[PDB]
From a paper:
The biocatalytic reduction of the oxime moiety to the corresponding amine group has only recently been found to be a promiscuous activity of ene-reductases transforming α-oximo β-keto esters. By studying the crystal structures of enzyme oxime complexes, analyzing molecular dynamics simulations, and investigating biocatalytic cascades and possible intermediates, we obtained evidence that the reaction proceeds via an imine intermediate and not via the hydroxylamine intermediate. To gain more insight into the reaction pathway, we determined the crystal structures of the two enzymes OPR3 and XenA in complex with the oxime substrates 1a–c, either by co-crystallization or by soaking. All the crystal structures obtained had a high resolution (1.9–1.35 Å) and showed clear electron density features for the oximes.
To assess if the introduced amino acid exchanges affected the overall structure and the binding of the oxime, we also crystallized the tyrosine variants in complex with selected oxime substrates. The protomers in the crystal structures of the tyrosine variants are perfectly superimposable with the ones of the wild-type enzymes, confirming that the exchanges did not lead to major structural alterations. Interestingly, the binding mode of the oxime substrates also did not change in most of the structures. The propanoyl moiety of oxime 1b points into this cavity and is likely stabilized by hydrophobic interactions. Substrates with an acetyl moiety (such as oximes 1a and 1c) give the non-productive binding mode described above. It must be emphasized that such a residue (like Y27 in XenA) has never been proposed to be involved in a reaction mechanism of these enzymes. Previous experiments with XenA Y27F showed no involvement in the oxidative half-reaction. Looking at the results obtained for XenA, product formation was comparable for both tyrosine variants, the canonical Y183F and the non-canonical one (Y27F). The calculated high Kd for oxime 1b clearly indicates this enzyme’s low affinity for the substrate and might explain why this enzyme performed poorly in the biotransformation of the other oximes in our previous work. Both the Y183F and the Y27F variants of XenA showed a non-Michaelis–Menten behavior, with a linear increase of the rate over the concentration (bottom right).
Author numbering:
A (entry chain B): 2 to 361
B (entry chain A): 2 to 366
Write the structure that this text describes.
């Protein structure tokens, strides 16, 4: 089974090709994780996935999506991640973290608490920032404050500080969150970036915030640990061929700037789109990024059935298959996949106290 | 769905009829549980089961099955369970514990490390105790020493102390391990009990250790929390009708002694048996105990699919369905069962950070 072949990248060896992508839990308080996250991450890691990327973790308080989002904007926040890192590693998985800034989508309620913007004057809300003073719209109406050059410098340094904290907490894999309509994605997209200075307009200018942030993080993130990013490569906004071509060029520049692997996703920059509502539509798109930018990739969105994950690898569309919601449903999904694909000694995907009893 | 109806026993209410039965993890050191157990139990409790009975926990060091078994023979051992109790409760489940003494099956290797008795020249082992100096046989050849009267008094007091510690740690449900060929079961069975004193040689004498231990625990265990036991009611040794009749009479005496629920199992007292493993094969046996002894019951050993669990309740065989190995495979099995049975808002079997995203309407529209 291709899904259960190991994978090497820099000094890291993943025991299989199953990655758990970042999934916000909305359970932190003032950015601090707690026993929700400790059990959640340790259980999924014991389930057998080779890599576990911890949820979008804000580089600054205003970069949280919600009041429940994790943060890494102080040393105390970073120290709280140490037992999570160590439990993931003790399970034989590789601990990663996605560091993030929600941009204009920040200051929102938790998804099961309305999912909508909280006003900045509410005690629970705060002021949001973005490349341009233009709202997402729909349930996120609040107009963000357009960033100055000083704001750009400050946020970049927050990403750098977050990466250094993640390093010292023991994460072995980092992912910059440049996808999903948050700050980085919104600098890239002409829908949200109306700037006419050095950070807007041309392809070079729209790419600048992302490339400068990557380069600044690269100075502090160890050369021997994978440096990765998530990026939305199309929007399903009627401009897909041109947008994908530009995104592939940015991926080439990421590679030239030291990126080791790209998590290929959708932009979600604006609500006026027509994104597919079915599984594995990203397969051929991720494949094109991988082949044309000559860079390892992962992708997600419906690959959480064992045969689909296996097919994507056999087709060389992906190097790792990210499986998100299936791991919320079943933290031992990797074992389920091994069983379904007929892997020899499939139960030993799990630790001995489970594996011994579940042997075929 | 019957499987998702609440159940009340004494002053404890379970949110559904899915119980996670005790399952040894073999990961403790010197009886102390650790991060293995913390995550293991918290994750299963978040999975939605209404009751989680923590694994066989030794009342005394020599009553561990293996060097990896949990213990509760000191207050520090009990304190180690406090965060497990709290995590199970925080998840909305009810924390129980099975307190145990492995008897002649003690001093064994972990199942994936040979599963057999530790040899004499291995310093990890210890002398075992039992009603009589007779080995189980097969892969458990070590001969135990026959208990003295003082040993009997001491082990009973160890059960009392263990129950008091479990109570003080916050457990809301206790299960005495009188099954599976361990110390209590071995007092009841004529295969293993060769005594001629007050503790063997008649039905009353063979029942005595179990009834005295129950009564001693009852003095310290709160009236308002379920007092339960697991007991092997037949052996599949060619003596089933007579053995089941005696076991059901003992169950009636457990009820008279304040037992609130019986976990109905197989004796496993000796290896020379022919157990007819199959789907839900214990259903009719559990129903017979339930009806003849007039005691609520649970059982296990093949109910671990959503339809088998639901059917055992619809057939009036069980009050709670114990689902063991399926929860090792999938800690969120209770959610899986709710989904498979078409329960309304099935994903809300889980906490919100999972339930929101797994809502069937959200997934389908
Ligand atoms: C609860 C939840 C939280 C998510 N949080 C993040 C996040 O923090 N960062 C991110 O890049 N994507 C996030 N996403 C997207 C997932 O990483 C993934 O792409 C998506 O769930 C699709 O994969 P799946 O079909 O296997 O679930 C989240 C998805 C879910 C369901
Ligand atoms: C790993 C494991 C450990 C077990 N440990 C115990 C135990 O501590 N106490 C007990 O009474 N039964 C124990 N048993 C038996 C289970 O409680 C249960 O009866 C058995 O798994 C059958 O139910 P199932 O078909 O749902 O798995 C154990 C079973 C397993 C698989
Ligand atoms: C829909 C795209 O947005 C995401 O997946 C996400 N983070 O990236 C969350 C928290 O939902
Ligand atoms: C087979 C009967 O014995 C059991 O189920 C048991 N404990 O009760 C263990 C640890 O295996």
């Amino acid at each position: 089974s291709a899904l259960f072949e190991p994978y090497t990248l820099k000094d890291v060896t993943l025991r299989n090709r199953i990655a758990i992508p970042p999934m916000c839990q909305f359970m932190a308080e003032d950015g601090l994780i707690n026993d929700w996250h400790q059990v959640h991450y340790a259980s999924m890691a014991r389930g057998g996935a080779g890599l576990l990327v911890v949820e979008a973790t804000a580089v600054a308080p205003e970069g949280r999506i919600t009041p429940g989002c994790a943060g890494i904007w102080s040393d105390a926040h970073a120290q709280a991640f140490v037992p999570v890192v160590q439990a993931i590693k003790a399970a034989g998985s590789v601990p990663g973290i996605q560091i993030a800034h929600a941009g204009r989508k920040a200051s929102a309620n938790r998804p099961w608490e309305g999912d909508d913007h909280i006003g900045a004057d509410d005690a629970r809300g705060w002021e949001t920032i973005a490349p341009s003073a233009i709202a997402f719209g729909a349930h996120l109406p609040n107009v963000p404050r357009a960033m100055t050059l000083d704001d750009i410098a400050r946020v970049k340094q927050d990403f750098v500080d977050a990466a250094r904290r993640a390093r010292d907490a023991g994460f072995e894999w980092i992912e910059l969150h440049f996808a999903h309509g948050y700050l980085g994605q919104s600098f890239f997209s002409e829908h949200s970036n109306k700037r006419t200075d050095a950070y807007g307009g041309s392809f070079d200018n729209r790419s600048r915030f992302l490339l400068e942030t990557l380069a600044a993080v690269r100075e502090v993130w160890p050369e021997n640990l994978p440096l990765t990013a998530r990026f939305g490569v199309l929007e399903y906004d009627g401009r897909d061929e041109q947008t994908l071509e530009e995104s592939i060029e940015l991926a080439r520049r990421f590679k030239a700037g030291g990126l080791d692997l790209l998590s290929v996703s959708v932009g979600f920059t604006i609500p006026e789109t027509n994104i597919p509502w079915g599984p594995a539509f990203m397969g051929p798109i991720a494949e094109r990024v991988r082949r044309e930018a000559k860079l390892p990739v992962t992708s997600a969105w419906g690959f959480g059935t064992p045969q689909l994950a296996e097919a994507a690898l056999q087709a060389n569309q992906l190097d790792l298959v990210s499986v998100g919601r299936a791991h919320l449903a079943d933290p031992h999904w990797a074992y389920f996949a091994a069983k379904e694909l007929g892997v020899e000694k499939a139960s030993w995907t799990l630790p001995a106290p489970y594996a011994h009893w579940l042997e075929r």
